[PDB]
Amino acid sequence: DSLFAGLVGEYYGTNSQLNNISDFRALVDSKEADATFEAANISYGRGSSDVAKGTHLQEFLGSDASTLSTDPGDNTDGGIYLQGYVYLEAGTYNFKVTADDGYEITINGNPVATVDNNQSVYTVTHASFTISESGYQAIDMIWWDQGGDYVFQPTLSADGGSTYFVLDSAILSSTGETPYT
């Protein structure tokens, strides 16, 4: 599998409505990804006029779009599924996520940030969680756009919410091996 400083990204589009996490996960299950990419700087958007139309996905992904495997065709609705590893020291953390529409982030298989509905842009400060052992932790994310505006910026705090960082190539690994890229 390729080793890079990022998460493995998949994009899926649909012409059905995405109302909630279940709907997007079912879309992921239903087919092969419409495009793959390397998610090395997970701060996407904001934009307008549907993520799944035209070149809006490219604009949304920005700095990560040069790794797209293809340019998807138009759809009404769409979203991303990211998976891989993140280096975190043992301790307490919490996410603070800005998004339109919803999303779910899991670490070591456990949900740590959830918005199970559509929404115009909103920032949630999520509850803390603990990491028991320093190292590369498993992480995955889903996010979608039902239409209209779109943005997705998870940030993470290690210091009780005083400072937050974007998850990017400093700490992400596609396989859990140390990237030297």
Q: What is the Rg, in whole angstroms, of the alpha carbon atoms belonging to the chain?
A: 15
For the bound state, the minimum distance from the C-beta of residue 90 to Ca ion, rounded and expressed in Å, comes to 31
Q: Which residues bind Ca ion (CB under 5 A)?
A: 17, 28, 62, 71-72, 76-77, 100-101, 120, 145-148
Which stretches of 17-149 are assigned E, i.e. beta strand? 35-39, 44-47, 77-88, 91-100, 103-107, 110-115, 122-125, 129-131, 135-145
For the bound state, the minimum distance from the C-beta of residue 66 to ligand INS, rounded and expressed in Å, comes to 26
Q: Confirm if 97 and 156 have CB atoms less than 8 A apart.
A: no
User: In this complex, which beta carbon is closest to Ca ion, that of residue 59 or of residue 136?
Assistant: 59
To the question of whether residue 33 is assigned a binding role by annotation, the answer is no
The H or E element that residue 154 is part of is: strand 150-157
Q: Confirm if 39 and 82 have CB atoms less than 8 A apart.
A: yes
User: In this complex, which beta carbon is closest to ligand INS, that of residue 17 or of residue 178?
Assistant: 17
* Strand, coil or helix: 63: helix
Determine how many CB atoms are found less than 10 A away from the CB of residue 93: 20
To the question of whether residue 28 is assigned a binding role by annotation, the answer is yes
Query: Beta strand 77-88 with 44-47: parallel, antiparallel or unpaired?
Result: unpaired
For the bound state, the minimum distance from the C-beta of residue 150 to ligand INS, rounded and expressed in Å, comes to 6
For the bound state, the minimum distance from the C-beta of residue 100 to ligand INS, rounded and expressed in Å, comes to 5
To the question of whether residue 120 is assigned a binding role by annotation, the answer is yes
In the window 117-156, what residues touch ligand INS (CB under 6 A)?
118-120, 146-149
In the window 53-112, what residues touch ligand INS (CB under 6 A)?
100-101
- Return residues touching ligand INS (CB under 6 A): 100-101, 118-120, 146-149
